[PDB]
Design a protein around this ligand. Sequence first.
Ligand code: OCT
Lengths: 79, 89
Amino acid sequence: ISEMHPALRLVDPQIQLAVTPKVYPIILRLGSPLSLNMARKTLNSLEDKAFQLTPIAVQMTKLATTEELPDEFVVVTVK
Amino acid sequence: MDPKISEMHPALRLVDPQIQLAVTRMNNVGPKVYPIILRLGSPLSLNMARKTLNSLEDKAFQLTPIAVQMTKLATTEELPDEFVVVTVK
Ligand SMILES: CCCCCCCC
């Protein structure tokens, strides 16, 4: 693992993928950067809408061993 | 700035709700699930992984692809009241 490129990155399990519902820890393979924002509609007119974004800080860790890997997880590969 | 939500650059797609993002937060504590909006600066792929053998000296993992169904939106009426935006690249 500590030699793969893009390296494997384990996302803090505060953020997981809900799949159908089971939730899975996330492993990232980032060939390009990713960003995550929470979005909330703050203005709702049929002619105009506004969305408030809030950046979500995501703690990750580069994996060195497979003993760190969960028993079930999703791998997201970004090109 | 783009003319319509159906032709943004990079493309905007709503991930079909069989796949959502679970964020633990907050009444009580627990996970809330959010629809995922993608801004597709680059392609992505999803694999389901399972550790099928948990022996220290002989571990094995099984990977199964997950088809990510996505939807092009026609108007902003299709944006949910709350969602997460994953921006690639
Ligand atoms: C924090 C990374 C989220 C992964 C998004 C997956 C979109 C199908």
